[PDB]
Structures are given as structure tokens and as C-alpha cells.
Symmetry: none
Subunit: 300 residues, 2 copies
């Protein structure tokens, strides 16, 4: 589950109950809504198989099973940069315009269930698990990552103030595809070093921070490491941890830390794809189920 080897995994957008009445029509006490915090669940990690296209199609299918007539946006445009052959770290989602929220109401018309109609997944996919890996040497990979967070009403004592499209992070999970305060040139790069001598992987899941000069395409990037990855290789898999960088904790306590605050200890799993480990991909989920992340990489 946390440890399951896979050729694909996904997490669906969590949508918390923002209703302020109970099913008996009585007010929820102390100004509270029915569900002010909705963590992710490991049981909700959706495991995938088949080709890259089949896996993506399955997730889009799931979106349309809920609403047949909503438009879907994908990460196809975002992942162009990487020219991945065997892996994906992507997303598929909808804003569900013109759809009412999911509601359940009393006879008198009071809402005791109210959930947003938004929907989406972040996921990784891999094809052709490696049959051979280098017996020696160190190899650099570069790529990207995506993420899906819990839904939480109060992260501190708006969602846009915190760098996300309105509501994301609060009434529904925060996602990489709704991050507004990142460098849209490349919001979420990732870097990895694989030591095939000692059989270790180290990496960084990075956010390129927002830059004021948006007219110069060669404006320098402002990287911020969100997670340090460490892992051990075993066959064509690797297992390890994602740890929130100290820098996030101390210098970004009022923003990034409100979303990325707990490690994923021994809760990161991935593997190599392409017959000779040309690429890699995987996932992690933090100890308190506050973030599900997926990541991918390609040899430099």
C-alpha cells in the first residue's frame, strides 16, 4: 500500500464537507463546519497498470464517470519539456463549471453535506520496468513532480494569499496544478543522483518560486527545495523517504510550510523504467497523510 511496487499510482482530489448543519437540522456548534480537516488515506491510493496512455485514459474515465459533461485539463502541455519515453508524473482535473456542489439536505432545506464539484488526480506512470541497470557509476536524472494535499479549513490562525487558486487547500485539497505562486515556466522541477556503486538515490523536489519579471524568458529561476529524497535500490525498485527541507520550515513557515510540514518516512517508493534504467518514477505519502507526491526523472 505504502510499500506496494507498481507501474502506476494516483490520488484523487479530496473534498471536505463544508456544511454547517447536522442531519437533524441543528447548527454545528461553535461556528464550525462538518469537516474542517480531511486528510488523505492510503486506501485511496489508486494503483494503475497498462501503457502510459491506458493509465491516463483510466483516470480521465473516472472523472467522466462522476460527470459526463465536464471538460478535462491534462498535464500533457506541462510535461512536453521533459520528452519522457517511459514515465509520467502528471495530472488530470476539471473545474466543473456550471456544476452545483454535492449536497444533501434536510426536509426544511438545511445542508448537512456540502462538497465541491471539483475533481482531479495527480499520478505517476511507468512502462518497461528496467531489466538491467548499471553495475557501477553515478548517474544524474532530471525531471518533475506533482502533488495532492489534504483539505484543511484553518492552516494558520485566503487560498490565494497562500499561493493557490481560490479554495484549493481549504475546501478541497491543494494541488500542483493550481499553484499560482510558482514560476509557470517550470513550476516543479526535480533532480536526482543515483549511485549505482553504493545503490543509493538522492534527490530534490523543487519549487521554482514566482519571479516578478515575467517578460524576459531567460530571467533566472528562484528554486526552493521542498523535499529531500533519500532511497536505497533493490532490483529495479527503490524505497526511502521524503523529508521537508529545513529551509521550508524556517524561512517559509507562513506559506509553503503550511502545506509541506510532515516527512514521508520510509513511505517513498519508486522504480526505474526503460530497459536500461533510462528513466525513473515514483510516489510518496507523508506520515500524517497530508501530502501525496509523485515524481519522474530522465537521465541527463
Amino acid at each position: 500500500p505504502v510499500n506496494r511496487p507498481a507501474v502506476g499510482a494516483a490520488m484523487r482530489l479530496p473534498r471536505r464537507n463544508i456544511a454547517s448543519y447536522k442531519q437533524d437540522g441543528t447548527e454545528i456548534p461553535d461556528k464550525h463546519q462538518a469537516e474542517e480537516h480531511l486528510p488523505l488515506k492510503e486506501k485511496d491510493i489508486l494503483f494503475l497498470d497498462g501503457t502510459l496512455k491506458e493509465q491516463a485514459d483510466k483516470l480521465k474515465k473516472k472523472i467522466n464517470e462522476r460527470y459526463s459533461d465536464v471538460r478535462v485539463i491534462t498535464s500533457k502541455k506541462e510535461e512536453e519539456k521533459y520528452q519522457y519515453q517511459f514515465v509520467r508524473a502528471g495530472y488530470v482535473f476539471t473545474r466543473a463549471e456550471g456544476k452545483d456542489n454535492e449536497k444533501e439536505k434536510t426536509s426544511d432545506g438545511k445542508e448537512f453535506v456540502n462538497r465541491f464539484s471539483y475533481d482531479g488526480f495527480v499520478y505517476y506512470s511507468g512502462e518497461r520496468p528496467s531489466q538491467s541497470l548499471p553495475s557501477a557509476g553515478t548517474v544524474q536524472y532530471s525531471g518533475n513532480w506533482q502533488y495532492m494535499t489534504d483539505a484543511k479549513r484553518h492552516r494558520t490562525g485566503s487560498s490565494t494569499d497562500l499561493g493557490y487558486t481560490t479554495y484549493y487547500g481549504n475546501e478541497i485539497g491543494a494541488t500542483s496544478y493550481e499553484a499560482r505562486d510558482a514560476d509557470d515556466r517550470e513550476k516543479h522541477p526535480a533532480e536526482y543522483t543515483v549511485d549505482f556503486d553504493n545503490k543509493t538515490l538522492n534527490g530534490k523536489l523543487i519549487k521554482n518560486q514566482y519571479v516578478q519579471n515575467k517578460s524576459n524568458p531567460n530571467e533566472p529561476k528562484k528554486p526552493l527545495t521542498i523535499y529531500d529524497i533519500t532511497a536505497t535500490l533493490d532490483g529495479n525498485r527503490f524505497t526511502g523517504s521524503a523529508k521537508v527541507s529545513t529551509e521550508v520550515k524556517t524561512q517559509h513557515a507562513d506559506k509553503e510550510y503550511l502545506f509541506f510540514h510532515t516527512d514521508a518516512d520510509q513511505r517513498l517508493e519508486g522504480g526505474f523504467f526503460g530497459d536500461n534504467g533510462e528513466e525513473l518514477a515514483g510516489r510518496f505519502i507523508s506520515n500524517d497523510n497530508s501530502v501525496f507526491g509523485v515524481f519522474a526523472g530522465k537521465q541527463k
Copy 2:
């Protein structure tokens, strides 16, 4: 921000980057001044404010021993104010690192100095002069070379790889390391004071105070704004030690206020002009 009114403020320990990889035997960051933006403003009860600081430490390390200013501040029996600290030596913890493919290396220690106040005074005397006594704390920049840590009166590393602090002062009188004295003129609407170090020297053994800062401020409502100035004594007679830490004034960068019914107590903060020292202070009517 530097001039923002507050009922509590804290500064976190600066930890400079001592990494020596990406020339001339230099480290990545040989001087780390403080920043006015890193002044952490606090609110809520005295307890709430302190707990927030302990929380931030625990957010970095869930399992470290935390040391507080509780024992030190007992003597003052403050009702409404605090000038304290919370810190950890982070025993057995690795430094903060980012790596080769080390271009970042920052110490594992952590801590804050802070002031806190509850119930800002809604009335003050319209006249008369009032004496206050209390204490202060401080946090300095981190600087590899202050001259051409133990010789300079601090626990190892403090002042160099991390900021020097009042709670790592080793050359002071343990009876009361950092007393403060104030006089408030409610006629002329002024505050004058001294932030002092009792130098190392029986409970009635004479003290050897050394004024570190002279404080001046003007009153406005239940607040006061002014300056902290390095003492004549430090600059001229302690050029080879204290002056290496206390060398620049805080001009119009000291802020505090009165707390309690009729200004029984006062507290505040200052930050020197070149961001070399952040100080906090508290006092109680004599």
C-alpha cells in the same frame, strides 16, 4: 516592521552557511546579519506566545531538550511582561545540509530571544517620575571574523557559526547576568534606561555592572519609540571584547510599551542599524 507596534516579538538564532564548496579558504557565508523581516511578532497570553516559540523548535526537532528562561526570570516576579529565551543544543543532531552531487551547512542549534506583554495599559500617569527595574536578552549576527568564542565570553561557536546570545554568555554574574534599569518621566513624556551586564566576579558581594546600552525614548499613548546606543564604556574601555558584539546603535529602532493597570510594567525590542544585534527588555515599577 522594525517600527511596528506589538505586544510580543522574537528573533530566531541566525546560523550562517559554513559550507566551503559551491576559494581563498572562505566559507559560503562569513557574515550573516539579522533581518528586520525575521522579527517574529507574537500575540496572545504570555503562555501562548512562549508556546508558539517552543512549537517552532519542536517543528524542527520533535525530540530535543528545550531550555527556557523560566529560572532566570523568577526573581523579577513579572505579572504582565517577559524578556526571555527558548533554545536547544540539539544534542546528537546533524547540521542542516544540502549536498554535493556540501554547498549548504548550517548548525543544528536553534533558539529565540523574545519579549512578551499582556494587557497593554489603557491608562498611564499624567505626571511624575517613575523608576523601573528588570532585565534584557539579546541575539547577535553570526560572524566568522570579528577581529584580526570562549575568549570573547561565549559558549563555543556562539558568535561565529551561529549568533551570540544572552543565554550563552559565560562571562557574566550568574546571580543576575543582564539587569536593566529605567526612569520614566511622565511630565516630559520620556523614558531613559540602561541595559547592563553584571560582569563575572557572597550573595551580597558587590556587582561589577557594565552598561552595554543607553536607552532613550519618547512616550506616545501606551507606547514608546526611541533608540539604543552603545555605551561610552563599551566603545572606549572594552574595544577588544564586548565592542566586537555591541558596536552599532539602534537609532529610532527601539519600540516598546506599557503593560498592566497604569504602566506597572514595560517591555520592548530593538534592532541595531546594521542588523548586528536584536535586543528585548522588560521592567517593573520599583
